[PDB]
Amino acid sequence: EFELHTLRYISTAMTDPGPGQPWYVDVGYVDGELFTHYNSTARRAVPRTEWIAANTDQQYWDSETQTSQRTEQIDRDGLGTLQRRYNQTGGSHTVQLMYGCDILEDGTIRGYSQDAYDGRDFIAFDKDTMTFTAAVPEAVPTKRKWEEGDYAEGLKQYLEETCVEWLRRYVEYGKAELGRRERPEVRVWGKEADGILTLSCRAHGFYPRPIAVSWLKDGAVQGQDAQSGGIVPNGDGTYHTWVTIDAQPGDGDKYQCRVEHASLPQPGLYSW
Template sequence: MALAVCLVITLAVSAAHCGSHTLLYHITIVSAPTTGVPQYSIIMYVDGVQYGRYNSDIRQAETSIPSLRELSKHIEKQTQYVQEYEMSQRHKLKFLIGFYNNTKSDRDTHIYQSRLACELHDDGTIGGYQEIAFDGKALLIFDKENVTYVPVTQEAEIVAQLWNKHYDSTNTKLYMENDCIEHLKLYLPYISTDLERKVPPNVKVSNSESESGTKLHCRVYGFYPRDVEVKWIKNGRDEIHSEEAAQILPNPDGTYQIRVSVGVTPEGGATYSCHIDHSSLEKPLVVKFEPNNGRYLYIIISVIVTLLLLLLPFALGLCIYRKRKTKGIYFNIKISLY
C-alpha cells in the first residue's frame, strides 16, 4: 500500500514571544520501510529555525548550523541518546498498533508522531508541551502541571488511561524542565546570529493546463528564516484556497522554498496575484500573474505554418497548371500566324 504521510502535527513552529525561546523535537516513526521516508526521524528546532536532525538512514545527529559544529562532543552524546530513545518510541508505536488492531487491520503501515518542546520565558520561568498523533490523527496531549496525558478526543480516553498506566509521565516532565532547557541555553549563544539572519524570498509565478483545468503556481524560494505565508488573491481581495497541502522544504544552502498551487476558472477581466509575507520584508510582496501571451502567439504561428504547408502542394499544382495552359495558348496563336 502506498504510504501518504499525513502530518497532523505540523512542522511549523509558532513565533516565540518577545524575549522567550523554544526548543522543539519533532519525532516520526513509520512501522514499515517506505521509499523516501526514514523509519525513524527527529528534526530539531530553536525558535522555529531548524538546527539539527537525526534519522535511521544517516544514524547520527547532524546540525545544519555551522557554528554548532564546535559542540562535536555534545552532538556525539545526542547521537547515543536518540538511538536509545528510538527503542522506547518504537515500543509506543507497537502499543498503539496493538490497541487499534481491530479497527485498523486494513492498514499495513502505521505512523507515530510526537512533538515535544520546552520553553524558556524572558522572566526566567519555564514551560513545555508534548502532542502525540497516530496514523494522521491527534491522540494525546501532555498535561505538565498534572503530570499526565489527556485525550484529544473522546474515543482516545481509553488509550490515555492505558498510556498513563504503561508509561511514566514523570520522565517527560523532568526532561522538559531540565535536559531540554539546558540544551536550549547551550545552543542560544551559538545560533543567535542565525536567529537574527533574514534573507528575502525570490518569487516566480506560472501556470499549467490540464484536462481538469488551469492551475496557477507560486514558487517562493531562497528565504530565511523558515516561517512564511503564501497565498493567491483574486481581483485584489478574494483569497483562493489551495486544495493541496504546501510544504516548506529546505535548500542545500540553509534557505527554504515552498510552492503554492491553486485551481482557477479563467474569467474575463479577472486578475490573480501571489501574496508573500515574510519577516525579511517590510511589507507583503505582491506578484501579479500575467498570462503567457507568448505561448498563445507560438500556438497561432504553429497553426499558420501548418496550414501553409498543407496548402503548398495545391498552390504549386495550380501554378504549374496555369503555366502549361498559358504555353498552350501561346503555341496555338503562333501557329495560326503562319
C-alpha cells in the same frame, strides 16, 4: 506569530518504512530549522547545521546518540506493545512522539510532549497537573505506567528547565542564520488556457516563514477564486509559496500580486 523561539524534537517508528528505509527516525528543529538527525540505520545522532556543529563537541553527540539509541529501543518495544493492545498483528503501524518548548512574545514559556499511534492522538502530557491525558482506552495502561514513580516529575523538569536552557543556547549559536531575513524573489505568470485566465504568483526563497501573499484587482484585495498552496520548504531552509486566481482573459492588466514579508520595508507589488 506569537512564538519567538521554539525547540522541537520528533520521532517516528514504523513497521513498514519501505524497502531499505530506516524504520526509526528522529529529528530536531530550532525555530523551524532542522538542526539534528538520527535514524535506526546510521545509529548516530548527527549535526544538521553549521552553527550546531561549531558549538558542540564529541561528548555532546555521544550523549545525543545514546539518548536516540534508547528512544529507538523504547520504540522497538512500543510497536509491539501497542499492536498487542489494539489486538493487531503485522500490517502498517506507526508510533510518533513530539515534544519540546516554546518561548513566546513577552517571555511566556510553553512545554509539551505528546504521542500518536497510527497517526492518531494516543496520549499527551499535562504538565500543569503532572498527569498524562489518555486519548483512547488503549492509552490508559500507558497513562498508569507513566504516572507511577518520578517520571512525570523529570519530564516536567526537562520541559520547563532543560529544554528552555538549551533552546536559548541554540538560538545564540545560530542567531546569524536564524535571525536573518531573506528577500523573496517573485514570479507572476499567466496561462490562457480554457476560456479562463489563471494568474499565478510565486514567492521564492523568503525567510523567515511567515508571509502574506494576496491578489489585488484594480487596487482592491481579491478574494474570489483565489487559491493558495500554503508555505512549502526549499532545500536550503528558505521557503516558497504560490497563490493563483482565476480571471477573464484580457483582464491581466487589472491584477497585482501583493507580498508582505519581514525582509521587505514596504509591501511588494508585482504585475504579470
